[PDB]
Design an enzyme around this catalytic site. Structure first.
Site, PDB file in Angstrom:
ATOM      1  N   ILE A 169       0.850  -1.182   0.000  1.00  0.00           N
ATOM      2  CA  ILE A 169       0.000   0.000   0.000  1.00  0.00           C
ATOM      3  C   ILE A 169       0.891   1.240   0.000  1.00  0.00           C
ATOM      4  CG2 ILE A 169      -1.729   1.333   1.266  1.00  0.00           C
ATOM      5  CD1 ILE A 169      -2.855  -1.251   2.338  1.00  0.00           C
ATOM      6  N   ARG A 172       3.580   8.681  -3.901  1.00  0.00           N
ATOM      7  CA  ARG A 172       4.121   7.388  -3.495  1.00  0.00           C
ATOM      8  C   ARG A 172       3.558   6.875  -2.173  1.00  0.00           C
ATOM      9  NH1 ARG A 172      10.523   8.302  -4.557  1.00  0.00           N
ATOM     10  NH2 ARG A 172      10.701   6.343  -3.374  1.00  0.00           N
ATOM     11  N   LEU A 207      -1.984   5.108 -12.263  1.00  0.00           N
ATOM     12  CA  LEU A 207      -1.746   3.676 -12.055  1.00  0.00           C
ATOM     13  C   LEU A 207      -1.402   3.330 -10.605  1.00  0.00           C
ATOM     14  CD1 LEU A 207      -1.474   1.027 -13.843  1.00  0.00           C
ATOM     15  CD2 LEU A 207       0.976   1.478 -13.818  1.00  0.00           C
ATOM     16  N   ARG A 208      -0.458   4.077 -10.039  1.00  0.00           N
ATOM     17  CA  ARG A 208      -0.019   3.884  -8.661  1.00  0.00           C
ATOM     18  C   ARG A 208      -1.192   3.959  -7.683  1.00  0.00           C
ATOM     19  NH1 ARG A 208       0.960   2.460  -3.787  1.00  0.00           N
ATOM     20  NH2 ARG A 208       1.506   4.139  -2.327  1.00  0.00           N
ATOM     21  N   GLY A 209      -1.960   5.042  -7.763  1.00  0.00           N
ATOM     22  CA  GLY A 209      -3.094   5.219  -6.877  1.00  0.00           C
ATOM     23  C   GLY A 209      -4.213   4.231  -7.140  1.00  0.00           C
TER      24      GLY A 209
END
EC number: 6.6.1.1
Lengths: 321, 321, 163
Positions: free
Chosen positions: A28, A191, A271-273
């Site tokens: 996460i 991040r 994408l990350r979130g």
């Protein structure tokens, strides 16, 4: 142990929720805990984390490996006493020297010990636990970066001095800080995993509650330790199911749709979130005591995983009820 | 751990197929990825490792040999457990000492037990996987060169100080760096057979696809690539167009090829030598009026340019007349 | 008794605490532990001034005469001390106030003072919220469970010493 679940409270849900979700999946990211330090963040962490099953590990072993077979050569701990000890929590001080964070290799000790010359840095002694960062804002950029990935990947990289020193570092990065200071390095902010939404008003009662549980814990007369322990285990049970469902999706033509829709509508694409939100939301059900899939899960985690970045709005509920 | 969907990555009608080609054979050449930092070069490399079936190898072993029978002498594998584990992908940060790259060797430890004195370097932990490079442009010559040939041949040759240390290093080298600094070493373009970039679609198309496969994240390996399969044709065309004219411009038995070959075929490391040869040869050619710097001229200057940094023992003629 | 070595030795002496009049709301614990809070009355007028010169110049040897004339003044000084003790237990009532606060620290595994100051402050702050004008021992012990613990070897005792 003296933990403060969702038995009775109307405010600091984000705090607990986030710290619990990360305890499930490290992928996460670091929990960007907004708000001032006066709220007693560390105090709450040094109580809530107690619900987790007291990890099995060697006595004075920094990394605290369970079995001796998993102890890094440098950490030649003579006392190979495999015992039970509570979740270690280290408060990362503001302005801490990077070298002291990960570790170093003294020259004199090196020529007389070799790998054994490695210094037990903060993170080296914070494995399998929680790391409370005072303020991510008023801190060196490179410090935040390093901490973020170390918690992400899981290796306390100390490739300095003259040797590729390294070792696992699976810990929950509790990146505390003020509400906002001035668009400080958005790249690092993205991040981060989850973040306590500041926009949502909260109660004050939690203050006294946490303070009391801080008191009635240290040298507790075997009262608060037991009482909460069953609940501690109950939560842990669900945590198992969460991980089991982590690499899976019960309802594909639902979770994927609603999740993406929310992110895109709010303009908080990334994408990350997105991929993280989809995971946390499913694992969230564990804390709720339910299956996994659920729109509201996506909605709730959205106002956390997205909150720590630009392009966000209250439209969450209004987008998909 | 949660990884980004390689196929679903925003566009990349180049990098993707390139990495796939090298997966079949590393001999094709290093993957040079142009573009800026925002391209997320590292992301693609590691994303591929996620879909790549876990390689069979020993547990506690850097080189990760399949069977214990293939464990290097100097190594000291304790856990001889042959199991499955994700494709090893190590990032090579700029500034890392050559020691940490190939492997360390302590003097005191050497006299004690020279065999077990060699510590496995970063490349050792990248065998049968992918090795990412930092700013290859600013990175040391001797570092880039070494990485290039090791990936080419397949053995991390550490035949120095008498000790003929060696070990498998069959990995794909991914050269990163900014677009162009200013008339950088041409040798890179030659050795990096797969000079691609990272096409970033501004328009929708993929953007929507990304969100959907990131949110829900399907499990079907087939569906993971199906829709993307057609694009391989376009990417292929790009690569074809290059190869269609490369031998025409950079004609064999002349140009960069032979220049680099000369150094590698002799007693010396590389790159820095090649750069010296190329410059002098070109300067001479200018005086000669020879538009094309023929091998004859390359060898002519080599007799001086290389000699003062290379163990000369004939060979040159036998390799390239 | 530190570093394992149980080093010890007699130290039966009288402690004389000095310092300026007052810096600014200094640690109250001093007033409690320093049972003899006196000063140095400096006569501006003659009286003693002449006496000083005479006994300094000639400096008699008789131990008796050395104190004789001064003996009467002990009564006045005594009155000063009496007046204090006459009301001290009334203001700083036992089983509460500074006494117990300091006692708690000393009766546990820790040095002192710095701990007491932490306890007193927190206890007073809490009392303010409670509306309790007098910071009772109950509140002192309540905050002690946290204020002292993070700098003191807790092993019960507290209750046995001061309920």
């Amino acid at each position: 142990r003296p933990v403060f679940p969702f038995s009775a409270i109307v405010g600091q849900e984000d705090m607990k929720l986030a710290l619990l979700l990360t305890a499930v999946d490290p992928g996460i990211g670091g929990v960007l805990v907004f708000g001032d330090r006066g709220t007693g963040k560390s105090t709450a962490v040094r109580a809530l984390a107690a619900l987790l099953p007291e990890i099995e590990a060697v006595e004075g072993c920094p990394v605290s490996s369970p079995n001796v077979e998993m102890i890094p050569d440098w950490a030649t701990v003579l006392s190979t006493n495999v015992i039970r000890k509570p979740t270690p929590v280290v408060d990362l001080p503001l302005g801490v020297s990077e070298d002291r964070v990960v570790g170093a290799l003294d020259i004199e000790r090196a020529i007389s010990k070799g790998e054994k010359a490695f210094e037990p840095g903060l993170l080296a002694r914070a494995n399998r636990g929680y790391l409370y960062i005072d303020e991510c804002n008023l801190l060196e950029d490179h410090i935040v970066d390093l901490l973020l990935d170390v918690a992400q990947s899981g290796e306390n990289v100390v490739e300095r001095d003259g040797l590729s020193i390294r070792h696992p570092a699976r810990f929950v990065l509790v990146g505390s800080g003020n509400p906002e200071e001035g668009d400080l390095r958005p790249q690092l902010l993205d991040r981060f995993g989850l973040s306590v939404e500041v926009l949502s008003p909260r109660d004050v009662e939690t203050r006294v509650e946490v303070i009391r549980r801080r008191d009635t814990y240290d040298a507790d007369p075997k009262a608060f330790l037991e009482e909460w322990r069953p609940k501690d285990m109950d939560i842990r049970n669900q945590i198992l199911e969460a991980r089991e469902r982590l690499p899976k999706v019960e309802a594909p033509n639902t979770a994927l749709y609603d999740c993406a829709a929310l992110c895109i509508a709010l303009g908080s694409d990334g994408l990350r979130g997105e991929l993280t939100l989809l995971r946390s939301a499913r694992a969230l059900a564990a804390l709720e005591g339910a299956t996994a899939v659920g729109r509201d899960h996506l909605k709730r985690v959205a106002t956390m995983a997205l909150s720590h970045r630009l392009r966000v709005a209250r439209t969450v509920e209004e987008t998909l009820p």
